[PDB]
Design an enzyme around this catalytic site. Structure first.
Site, PDB file in Angstrom:
ATOM      1  N   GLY A  97      -0.337  47.262  13.892  1.00 59.55           N
ATOM      2  CA  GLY A  97      -0.997  46.510  12.821  1.00 59.55           C
ATOM      3  C   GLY A  97      -2.038  45.516  13.306  1.00 59.55           C
ATOM      4  O   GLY A  97      -2.223  45.331  14.511  1.00 59.55           O
ATOM      5  N   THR A  98      -2.715  44.869  12.357  1.00 62.55           N
ATOM      6  CA  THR A  98      -3.748  43.877  12.671  1.00 62.55           C
ATOM      7  C   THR A  98      -3.107  42.580  13.161  1.00 62.55           C
ATOM      8  O   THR A  98      -1.909  42.363  12.976  1.00 62.55           O
ATOM      9  CB  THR A  98      -4.642  43.558  11.451  1.00 62.55           C
ATOM     10  OG1 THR A  98      -3.860  42.933  10.425  1.00 62.55           O
ATOM     11  CG2 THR A  98      -5.294  44.824  10.893  1.00 62.55           C
ATOM     12  N   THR A  99      -3.911  41.719  13.780  1.00 65.46           N
ATOM     13  CA  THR A  99      -3.405  40.474  14.358  1.00 65.46           C
ATOM     14  C   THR A  99      -3.203  39.398  13.288  1.00 65.46           C
ATOM     15  O   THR A  99      -4.091  39.148  12.470  1.00 65.46           O
ATOM     16  CB  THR A  99      -4.352  39.933  15.450  1.00 65.46           C
ATOM     17  OG1 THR A  99      -4.689  40.987  16.362  1.00 65.46           O
ATOM     18  CG2 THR A  99      -3.696  38.789  16.226  1.00 65.46           C
TER      19      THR A  99
END
Ligand SMILES: [Cl-]
Lengths: 240, 235, 241, 250, 243, 244, 195, 231, 111
Positions: E29-31
């Site tokens: 996933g994204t940060t």
């Protein structure tokens, strides 16, 4: 509760549990049904592998569902009791609510419906039973004979057989039964039914059961000696 | 083993796709829609000559204005017919009117995907639902175990379907009479059936606005078979 | 080989999922120790904060179950907190129903029974934890009762749990062989904590700062945990003799 | 969630064996030896207190358990399984008998109830069988003194004397030579201690041996006086000192 | 083998492989990050612009629970929404019975026990998210991070997603260089920088920055989204630091 | 999920057989032999206990022969614990019928009920079947003395003489040889003991390895008596018939 | 409904039941048959609350017919009466009890004896030489107590029954429009069409 | 592979294959386009027939006076999800006298789809949805995936060959967003967008399906000769 | 004891012409001797050229009209936007009313 889908489709579009239930029917003792002009006769095979049997008390192969309708079967004996009980309860329920006994077609449609239900309900296996249902509709003199199978399909038959070696006795019936002129009397119908079983049975002794159903709730089971007289007369004509 | 509600890598439900294979093994059923009515015809396919063929019931009334023909595991159709009849009658009770043919079809198709670990498997039967209502006139629908239904000018299902559908592609036009449709169903059934077509191994039916749903007598169908034979010998 | 996936018997009469739950118990790489005084019960546990981004005050494996009962856990924190919440609920319910505080040994038996069920029922997995319950019971006095993933439990004079439990156990055994009594003959809990830390240092062969340890103390009518500065005072006293 | 294991985990194999029951019996075989002997005026049940650690207080772990004032139980196999069965057995003695008839069940019927619970764990959905064999000793007015064995399958049998677990085969042979129908309770205790010594490796004393009797009524253990018909429990657990006294006359 | 085919099964190691596989979805996933400041907490997340057709500022990721708790997560977005829905039910029932808004440590265990419960049975799948959450209660500011196993601890700073290693290093510098603490306004600026720096692991597509905060002095202990001028100021500060 | 571990206890084989029923029947073939013989003036039940011990308390022991009511008894072959579950259900069914109609339950109605319970475990529920075969010995005023058997499939049949458990093939052949319709109880007692003596896997047939019962109208006048034989009474009948 | 009477003589049981059905103000029918044949040799008459009477009677009839088919056997009068008693005893502690009183007249073919059972809506059963429900017994029992003999013929039973009906027609305020009379013996059930 | 038997199983790389297979069903479906301006929102859908005798399967479903969607994939699943949206729109109007916000409708669809991805026995939905609507914050367009992921967009396309229409909308972004107060021109842009996804077949009178909702325009569907004007 | 019913007064009137129909009602709402409102609409356009009024207990009246308007909406959804005819609406309202046979809507309805 146990919910497992036991009856499911396979890649070739077959439901194997239903098809394997038919294999249990193939193993069961032979049953035959023949309708005359004014009667229906149900014949059943008794395997003589079991002697020392008490024939008074042993479960008989033909069962009255009501006073005017009978049911015979091929396949698992224990399974058949469940269908017979359900059919008997429904017969009394119909009399209670409609104020008329079941037609033979209605009773067949009900039993067939129960069988179908057990092919797409979770946690249950199909009945390993095919049935022959025979009798007369209330206030009607036209003979009725139907067949059901594990899948739940049903249909009417001029004459039909189920169980082991039923392929052979159906062969006999297909060449010996004329639709334009069905067995005109009880004698002729019983004779044709005993003849059809003698193609498969072995000894004509305590191996053949015969039940005659006539209109207006007239149902009687023939004894050993009465059947033995048919067995005797058939072979004495055959010696020629 | 594997779930009954499992998707394949192609994005299709295994059990639904397998039930479609069972329907391919079923006896042929054909429907043709005209501006004068919709015709429904079936192959009876008795397994033995001792089987009384008029007890084979593959064309069924749902209501006065809606009929239905089946192909595949025909025992599975009984609860579907029961639901359809109940839905048609219930809507009349609630609304004092006939139910639309599309709405009836949609109600039947809502049962289809109600399986899992509800019933243990999909239905193994396909239905041709034909009828008439005031809003959309004469209609023919094809109800599948996937829950999908398509409207058709003409449609064939069962073992002889793709050969029959190609034939229906060439023969159907928007000016067909009811008589022309009857002969056309008989002609195409005769083409795809194993045994020779007669009034005992095939059955016709129709739905008109005036007379409603009617299953044809064996005597009535026998005449239409004789009329078909003569017009094919006419050229 | 599905007898290894769920809690059914193997051909040797063994439960592999239970055995593997015992192995999960050492996943945190932490050792704990418990001893009894005259008036108290002390439990100590190693504290490791490997990430600088962590808030060290929230890193703990000692739980205040009730006013009187403390619990130290050997095993992963999710299963530890699962057992902690249940033990707290059971202790509170007991007091409501029976009108007196739940004894340490009775809570241990109850949690042991719950664990037994997970070894017999297939749909539930064992918790990968060992639970050491401590208190000063009003009838039995200083008490240590320990539960495991098999549903086994028993009382202890003293006990140890973790990857290096054997070293600590033998060290404790040797001391009680000398003294010939079932407890630490000391008046104050402070000195019983000092005994506990000293013998853990001896057994593991490692020194401890104030942030390397975690301490719980049970006295009559209360269980409490020590702060870093309370532990520091304990460490200073150990070093000064 | 929901328990979705509604199917049996014990099933018949092609040879007719119920695998999970056989495997449960194997777990019992690995268990510590326990025994029971019936005398004319009492019954004795005994086992070894196999302490898992010397830091553990083995007095807090009870292998011999009171089920009713006149019935006691010992086991071989999985300890936790035994503990929950003792809880269920104590409760069922009340719910299915004492709350109905106002008296404690006879030995044979309490055994029957415990047996039923063990049978159901062999057929019901999503569970394994209990990994224990039980020895249940008791007395009641009309049946006198009795001793029963209950296995993982739910089967139970009455014994004059028997042994289960680790060294049961050797212990049963030892009991066959010594048992007669004229034994007094003290003779049976003496034979029990002799038999148990053979299967014990290490220390053999009152602190490592757990022994209880079903014998005379103990009015001193009743806790109250005034009702003539109430005369006290027949179950009594022997102390560490009482065992050691009989180990000198050994 | 076969131990990894079913949830809640212990491997011969004593591991639950299905939970470890859920962690892989989180790492994909994204940060997203969290910073604990002097009197509150700041949350920030990277939103990947997959196409020009995405409406700017519309697809909001950070979620509020009650009025004092913020939640952000990386991994399967729907799983995160499911966890926040449960959290909102837990907070509502706590406030219903006890009147006071749910304390942050209390709220942390409610999420923790629920996530842990999804590791007890094979009839459910573990959560495919790691959740960073927190806010202000009666005892001050609290920041937590919760994993698929149900494991959670309190944090000074937290990070998860594809660029978590980069972010963690940046957070560790702030902890060392500010033992006295960080202000809420400073934390917003720093959060913008850290997300911009962590975007190097996702450099193919451009992104949109989203920040929120709860502070005793700046937001009265309520969760609010950083908007307009304050957001632009943080974007400018971040862009200046990467150049 | 859970499907992985399901044995599917209620499915047909490709040949149309029920796996679990067949395997349960295999289990029963290793149980001690039980025999029932029906005579004109009563019924005999004889059964062999499985390899016993000298320390087993025989006079209080019961593993084979059970009373269902005053008129009906059963002989068990298979898992004893499974049998006691069904026996208790049958005892309740008998009392339910007596309460409803104020008449003792006819033998076949009790037999059909227990057999239907066995059938259910083969068609639905996903549970293992009961590993038990019963011989039912009973009397009612409709059919008089009756013998039935039932097995794990839930199928039942009536008999003049029958065996279940171990060595049924050998036992049934011996019974078929010496049984006659005009036989009396005292003759049937001898036949049952002689058949067990020849089919047993033990070295010799003694009193401590047997359970014995008779159902006689040898009850003073128009009534029926059940007699579960005591150990000394089994010892005496063994001497009388000349086996020991 | 109103009057139902029963008498057990030497070789038969005779049941007499009124023909009137009254809905408050008007007599809606004067030919109502308040009885159901449960089996070939067992008859049940009934009286009580409207609707529940016929519903209960037909429910019992359906159950006995079901038993007859299942076992191919006719239950004894004693067994049928016990089944009926239990159903009424169950009903009295229900949400809405069956308000129905019955007489069961049967000929036991095994014992070759007629049998008459009286059961009220509570499930109170007694076997009697003669019985009734409601106020019918108040007018008729003194006549039956005087004339009844256990060795009476069927014809003598009918004559004693006529005397009972005559006393009812004299002293009862309600017009019950006569009675339908049915006889139960070894040959089954028949209706006396002139009474 | 060994991890695609049910929705309750992660793969070793953290993938959910049953969900991915459900996503594949959308790619097999017929193309449908969504786009909006500041005053109106438009759906365009290419309907698919079985053969020349058959009807063209309907693609657009009305959910309320101010909201509706178009589908691609399993049609019965779209019926289940659209029924749920109808109920939720209805609950909002009946209980709160409030038209359901398009963004909140997206959140509800996400959560309903999620429950079918984390439990045993069930299966994911096999359909993708494009939801358009006009509420208190103007025109909106949403894209729904049965993974649970819902996204707000200016324009998009789903189904077979949807990539061509999506690129066209990405080019035209600055033009079609400005088409305010002109419904016909916005539909023209949508018809031109869906044309970038056609091969071999072209837009006919029974092939094309169009829907529009806007400032003073209830959600209405155009089929038959009503779309001949745009062919 | 709690009384779930009330009386809000009001009078309504429906007349059918040859090619038209009128439904009229007063706009006054009351309890006991007090006026709640001088203008509270009581006759409603329900769509499909149908007008409705449920007079009596206003809470039940509002509930019924609301449920019928809803039924019209779902009739369109379920039956391809077919116009609900006046006879079909009437039968549908019977079922709405009889559904609460044992706890009735205390109103007199006219469409
Ligand atoms: Cl417990």
């Amino acid at each position: 509760g146990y919910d497992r889908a036991l009856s499911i489709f396979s890649p070739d579009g077959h439901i194997f549990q239903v098809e394997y239930a038919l294999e249990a029917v193939k193993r069961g003792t032979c049953a035959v049904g023949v309708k005359g002009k004014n009667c229906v006769v149900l014949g059943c095979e008794r395997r003589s592998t079991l002697k020392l049997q008490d024939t008074r008390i042993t479960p008989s192969k033909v069962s009255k569902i009501d006073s005017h309708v009978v049911l015979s079967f091929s396949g698992l004996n224990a399974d058949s009791r469940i269908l017979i009980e359900k059919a008997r309860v429904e017969a009394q329920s119909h009399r209670l609510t409609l104020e008329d006994p079941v037609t033979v077609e209605y009773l067949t449609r009900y039993v067939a419906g129960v069988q179908q239900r057990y092919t797409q309900s979770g946690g249950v296996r199909p009945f390993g039973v095919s049935t022959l249902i025979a009798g007369f509709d209330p206030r009607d003199d036209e003979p009725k004979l139907y067949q059901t199978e594990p899948s739940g399909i049903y249909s009417s038959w001029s004459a039909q057989t189920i169980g082991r070696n039923s392929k052979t006795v159906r062969e006999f019936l297909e060449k010996n039964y004329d639709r334009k002129e069905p067995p005109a009397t009880v004698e002729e119908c019983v004779k044709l039914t005993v003849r059809s079983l003698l193609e498969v049975v072995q000894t004509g002794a305590k191996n053949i059961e015969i039940t005659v159903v006539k209109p207006d709730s007239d149902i009687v089971a023939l004894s050993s000696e009465e059947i033995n007289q048919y067995v005797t007369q058939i072979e004495q004509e055959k010696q020629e | 083993d594997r779930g009954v509600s499992t998707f394949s890598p192609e994005g299709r439900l295994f059990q639904v796709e397998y039930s479609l294979e069972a329907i391919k093994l079923g006896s042929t059923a054909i429907g043709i829609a005209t501006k004068e009515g919709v015709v429904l015809g079936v192959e009876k396919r008795a397994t033995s000559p001792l089987l009384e063929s008029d007890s084979i019931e593959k064309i069924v009334e749902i209501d006065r204005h809606i009929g239905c023909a089946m192909s595949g595991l025909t025992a599975d159709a009984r609860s579907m017919i029961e639901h359809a009849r109940t839905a048609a009658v219930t809507h009349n009770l609630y609304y004092d009117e006939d139910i639309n043919v599309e709405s009836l079809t949609q109600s039947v198709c809502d049962l289809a995907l109600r399986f899992g670990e509800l019933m243990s498997r999909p239905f193994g039967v396909a239905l041709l639902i034909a009828g008439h209502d005031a809003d959309d006139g004469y209609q023919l629908f094809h109800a599948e175990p996937s829950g999908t239904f398509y409207r058709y000018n003409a449609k064939a299902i069962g073992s002889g379907s793709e050969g029959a559908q190609a034939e229906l592609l060439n023969e159907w036009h928007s000016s067909l009479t009811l008589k022309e449709a009857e002969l056309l169903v008989l002609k195409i059934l005769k083409q795809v059936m194993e045994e020779k077509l007669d009034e005992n191994n095939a059955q016709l039916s129709c739905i008109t606005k005036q007379d409603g749903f009617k299953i044809y007598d064996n005597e009535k169908t026998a005449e239409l078979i004789k009329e078909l034979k003569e017009k094919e010998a006419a050229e | 080989g599905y007898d290894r996936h769920i809690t059914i018997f193997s051909p040797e009469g063994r439960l592999y999922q239970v055995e593997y739950a015992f192995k999960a118990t050492n996943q945190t790489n932490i050792n704990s120790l418990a001893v009894r005084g005259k008036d108290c019960t002390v439990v100590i546990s190693q504290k490791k904060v490997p990430d600088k981004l962590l808030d060290p005050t929230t890193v703990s494996y000692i739980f205040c179950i009730s006013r009187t009962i403390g619990m130290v856990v050997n095993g992963p924190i999710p299963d530890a907190r699962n057992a902690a919440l249940r033990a707290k609920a059971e202790a509170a319910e007991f007091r409501y129903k029976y009108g007196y505080d739940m004894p340490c040994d009775v809570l241990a038996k109850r949690m042991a029974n719950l664990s037994q069920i997970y070894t017999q029922r297939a749909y539930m997995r064992p918790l990968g934890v060992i639970l050491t319950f401590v208190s000063v019971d009003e009838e039995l006095g200083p008490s240590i009762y320990k539960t495991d993933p098999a549903g086994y439990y028993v009382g202890y004079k003293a006990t140890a749990t973790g990857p290096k439990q054997q070293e600590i156990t033998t060290n404790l055994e040797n001391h009680f062989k000398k003294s010939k009594i079932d407890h630490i003959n000391e008046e104050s809990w402070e000195k019983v904590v000092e005994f506990a830390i000293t013998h853990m240092i001896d057994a593991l062969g490692t020194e401890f700062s104030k942030n390397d340890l975690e301490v719980g103390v049970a006295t009559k009518d209360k269980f409490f945990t020590l702060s870093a500065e309370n532990i520091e005072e304990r460490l200073v006293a150990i070093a000064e003799q | 969630m929901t328990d979705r294991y509604s199917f049996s985990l014990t099933t018949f194999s092609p040879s007719g064996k119920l695998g999970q029951i056989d495997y449960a019996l194997t777990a019992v075989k690995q268990g510590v030896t326990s025994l029971g002997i019936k005398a004319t005026n009492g019954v004795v049940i005994a086992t070894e207190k196999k302490s898992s650690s010397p830091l553990a207080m083995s007095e807090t772990l009870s292998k011999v358990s009171l089920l009713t004032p006149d019935i006691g139980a010992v086991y071989s196999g999985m300890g936790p399984d035994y503990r929950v069965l003792v809880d269920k057995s104590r409760k069922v003695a009340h719910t299915s008998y004492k709350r109905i008839y106002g008296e404690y069940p006879p030995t044979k019927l309490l055994v029957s109830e415990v047996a039923k619970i063990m049978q159901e764990a062999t057929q019901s959905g999503g569970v394994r069988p209990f990994g224990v064999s039980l020895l249940i000793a008791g007395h009641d007015e009309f049946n006198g003194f009795s001793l029963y064995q209950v296995d993982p399958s739910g089967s139970y049998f009455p014994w004059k004397a028997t042994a289960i677990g680790k060294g049961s085969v050797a212990a049963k042979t030892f009991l066959e030579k010594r048992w007669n129908d004229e034994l007094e309770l003290e003779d049976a205790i003496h034979i029990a201690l002799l038999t148990l010594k053979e299967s014990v490796e290490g220390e053999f004393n009152g602190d490592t041996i757990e022994l209880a009797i079903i014998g005379d009524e103990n009015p001193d253990l009743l806790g109250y006086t005034g009702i003539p018909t109430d005369k006290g429990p027949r179950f009594r657990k022997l102390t560490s000192q009482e065992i050691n006294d009989r180990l000198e006359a050994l | 083998t076969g131990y990894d085919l079913s949830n809640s099964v212990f491997s011969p190691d004593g591991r639950n492989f299905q939970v470890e596989y859920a962690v892989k979805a989180v790492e994909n996933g994204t940060t997203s990050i969290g910073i604990k400041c002097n009197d509150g907490v700041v949350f920030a997340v990277e939103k990947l612009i997959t196409s020009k057709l995405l409406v700017p500022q519309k697809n909001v990721k950070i979620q509020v629970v009650d009025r004092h708790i913020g939640c952000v997560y990386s991994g399967l977005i729907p799983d995160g929404r499911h966890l926040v829905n449960r959290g909102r039910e837990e907070a509502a029932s706590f406030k219903k019975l006890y009147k006071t808004p749910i304390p942050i440590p209390a709220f942390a265990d409610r999420l923790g026990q629920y996530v842990q419960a999804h590791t007890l049975y094979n009839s459910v799948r573990p959560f495919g998210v790691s959740t960073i959450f927190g806010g202000v209660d009666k005892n001050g500011a609290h920041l937590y991070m919760l994993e698929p196993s149900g494991s959670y601890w309190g944090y000074k700073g937290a990070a998860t997603g594809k660029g978590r290693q980069s972010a963690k290093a940046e957070l560790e510098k702030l902890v060392d260089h500010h033992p006295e603490g960080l202000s809420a306004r400073e934390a917003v600026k720093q959060a913008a920088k850290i997300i911009y720096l962590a975007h190097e692991d996702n450099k193919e597509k451009d992104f949109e920055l989203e920040i929120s905060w709860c502070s005793l002095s700046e937001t009265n202990g309520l969760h609010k989204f950083v908007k307009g001028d304050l957001l632009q100021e943080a974007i400018d500060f971040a862009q200046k630091e990467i150049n | 999920g859970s499907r992985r571990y399901d044995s599917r206890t209620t499915i047909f084989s490709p040949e149309g057989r029920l796996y679990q029923v067949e395997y349960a029947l295999e289990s029963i073939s290793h149980a001690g032999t039980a025999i029932g013989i029906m005579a004109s003036d009563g019924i005999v039940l004889a059964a062999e206990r499985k390899v016993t011990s000298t320390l087993l308390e025989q006079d209080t022991s019961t593993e084979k022969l059970y009373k269902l009511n005053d008129k009906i008894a059963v002989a068990v072959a298979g898992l004893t614990a499974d049998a006691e579950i069904l026996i208790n259900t049958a005892r309740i069914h008998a009392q339910n019928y007596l309460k409803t109609y104020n008449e003792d339950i006819p033998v076949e109605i009790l037999v059909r009920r227990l057999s239907d319970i066995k059938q259910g475990y083969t068609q639905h529920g996903g549970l293992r079947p009961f590993g038990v075969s019963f011989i039912y010995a009973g009397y009612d005023d409709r059919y008089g003395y009756q013998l039935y058997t039932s097995n794990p499939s839930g199928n039942y049949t009536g008999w003049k003489a029958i065996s279940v458990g171990a060595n049924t093939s050998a036992a049934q052949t011996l019974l078929q040889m010496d049984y006659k319709d005009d036989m009396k109880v005292d003759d049937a007692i001898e036949l049952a003991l002689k058949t067990l003596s020849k089919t047993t896997d033990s070295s010799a047939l003694t009193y401590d390895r047997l359970e014995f019962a008779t159902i006689r109208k040898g009850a003073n006048d128009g009534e029926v008596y059940q007699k579960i034989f005591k150990p000394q009474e089994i010892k005496d009948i063994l001497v009388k018939t000349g086996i020991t | 409904m109103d009057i139902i009477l029963g008498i057990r003589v030497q070789d038969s049981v005779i049941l007499a039941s009124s023909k009137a059905v009254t809905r408050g103000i008007s007599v809606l029918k004067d030919s109502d048959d308040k009885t159901r044949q449960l089996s070939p040799h067992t008859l049940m008459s009934f009286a009580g609350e409207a609707g529940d009477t016929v519903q209960f009677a037909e429910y019992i009839q359906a159950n006995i017919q079901l038993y007859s088919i299942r076992e191919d056997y006719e239950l004894s009068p004693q067994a049928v009466s016990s089944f009926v008693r239990q159903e009424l005893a169950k009903s009295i502690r229900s949400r809405r009890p069956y308000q129905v009183n019955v007489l069961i007249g049967g000929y036991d073919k095994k014992k070759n004896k007629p049998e008459l059972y009286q059961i009220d809506y509570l499930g109170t059963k007694v076997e009697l030489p003669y019985g009734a429900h409601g106020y019918s017994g108040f007018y008729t029992f003194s006549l039956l107590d005087h004339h009844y003999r256990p060795d009476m013929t069927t014809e003598e039973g009918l004559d004693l029954l006529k005397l009972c009906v005559q006393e009812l027609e004299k002293r009862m305020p309600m017009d019950f429009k006569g009675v339908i009379v049915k006889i139960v013996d070894k040959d089954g059930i028949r209706q006396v069409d002139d009474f | 592979n060994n991890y695609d038997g049910d929705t309750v199983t992660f793969s070793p790389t953290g993938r959910l294959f049953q969900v991915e297979y459900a996503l594949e069903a959308i790619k097999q479906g017929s193309v449908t386009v969504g786009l909006r301006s500041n005053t109106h929102a438009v759906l365009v859908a290419l309907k698919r027939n079985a053969d020349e005798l058959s009807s063209y399967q309907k693609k657009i479903i009305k959910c309320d006076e101010h909201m509706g969607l178009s589908l691609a994939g399993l049609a019965p699943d779209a019926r289940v999800l659209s029924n749920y949206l109808r109920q939720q729109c209805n609950y909002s109007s009946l209980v709160f006298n409030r038209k359901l916000a398009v963004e909140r409708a997206g959140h509800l669809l996400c959560d309903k789809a999620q429950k079918n991805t984390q439990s045993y026995g069930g299966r994911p939905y096999g359909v993708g949805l494009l939801i358009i609507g006009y509420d208190k914050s103007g025109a909106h367009l949403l894209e729904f995936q049965p993974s649970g992921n819902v996204t707000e967009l200016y324009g998009t396309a789903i189904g077979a060959r949807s990539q061509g229409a999506k690129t066209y909308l990405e080019r035209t972004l600055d033009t079609f967003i400005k088409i305010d107060g002109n419904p016909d021109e916005l539909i023209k842009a949508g018809v031109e967008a869906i044309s970038q996804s056609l091969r071999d077949e072209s837009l006919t009178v029974d092939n094309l399906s169009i829907a529009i909702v806007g400032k003073d325009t209830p959600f209405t569907i155009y089929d038959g000769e009503a779309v001949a004007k745009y062919i | 004891q709690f009384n779930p019913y009330g009386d809000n007064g009001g009078t309504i009137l429906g007349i059918a012409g040859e090619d038209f129909a009128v439904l009229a009602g007063d706009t006054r709402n009351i309890t006991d001797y007090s006026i709640n409102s001088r203008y509270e609409p009581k006759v409603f356009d329900c769509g499909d050229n149908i007008v409705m009024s449920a007079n009596g207990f206003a809470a039940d009246g509002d509930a019924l009209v609301k449920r019928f308007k809803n039924s019209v909406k779902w009739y369109h959804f379920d039956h391809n936007d077919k116009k609900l005819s006046i006879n079909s609406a009437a039968r549908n309202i019977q079922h709405l009313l009889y559904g609460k046979r044992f706890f009735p809507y205390y109103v007199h309805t006219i469409i």
